[PDB]
Amino acid sequence: GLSDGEWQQVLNVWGKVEADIAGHGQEVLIRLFTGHPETLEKFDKFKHLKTEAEMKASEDLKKHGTVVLTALGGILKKKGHHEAELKPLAQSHATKHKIPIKYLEFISDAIIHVLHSKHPGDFGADAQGAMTKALELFRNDIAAKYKELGFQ
Numbered sequence: 001g002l003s004d005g006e007w008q009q010v011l012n013v014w015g016k017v018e019a020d021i022a023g024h025g026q027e028v029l030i031r032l033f034t035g036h037p038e039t040l041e042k043f044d045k046f047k048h049l050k051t052e053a054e055m056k057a058s059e060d061l062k063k064h065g066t067v068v069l070t071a072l073g074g075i076l077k078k079k080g081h082h083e084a085e086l087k088p089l090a091q092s093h094a095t096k097h098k099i100p101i102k103y104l105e106f107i108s109d110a111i112i113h114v115l116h117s118k119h120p121g122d123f124g125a126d127a128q129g130a131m132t133k134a135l136e137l138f139r140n141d142i143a144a145k146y147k148e149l150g151f152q
């Protein structure tokens with residue numbers, strides 16, 4: 001549950017991401033994979049990437065970064081009213097991709113990390129707070145659908 005003030009901050013921060021969605025998406029996935037190597041194993045099309053340089057050079061990783069952040073952005077722009085958008089993601093990630101909720105926590109923190117890295121001094125305390133709450137909301141609603149499905 002975010003206030004409109006907090007949503008305003010979220011979408012303001014998101015404007016930074018949309019100015020370069022591929023570059024942001026790329027660094028988020030790289031931060032995830034290098035921070036938490038077990039996550040790489042969930043991607044049959046990235047598990048070949050043994051080094052970060054290979055990750056950096058991968059146009060398909062950048063492409064997937066775009067898909068992921070485009071989806072997240074569409075969800076954030078709903079300001080919490082995202083049941084329709086979120087349910088198919090929850091379902092594919094529990095039933096097909098088999099992504100534990102822990103990894104959604106991982107990528108949440110990775111987003112925070114990347115924003116600070118790309119916008120040092122331009123991602124204030126209030127902005128971080130709002131974005132964090134937004135990602136928690138996202139995660140919590142996915143977690144509800146996981147429980148429904150009995151997925152661990």
Ligand code: HEM
Nearest residue numbers: 039042043045067068071072088089092097099103104107
């Ligand atoms: C903000 C969080 C995330 C968003 C918005 C997101 C979104 C998406 C979307 C839109 C797709 C393609 C459509 C689909 O299969 O449902 C996808 C595919 C996929 N995602 Fe996620 N995802 C997120 C987090 C994660 C995480 C943390 C992992 C694993 C650590 C993951 C693993 C995968 C895999 C393995 C695929 C299939 C890739 C392929 O084979 O083409 N996702 N994701």
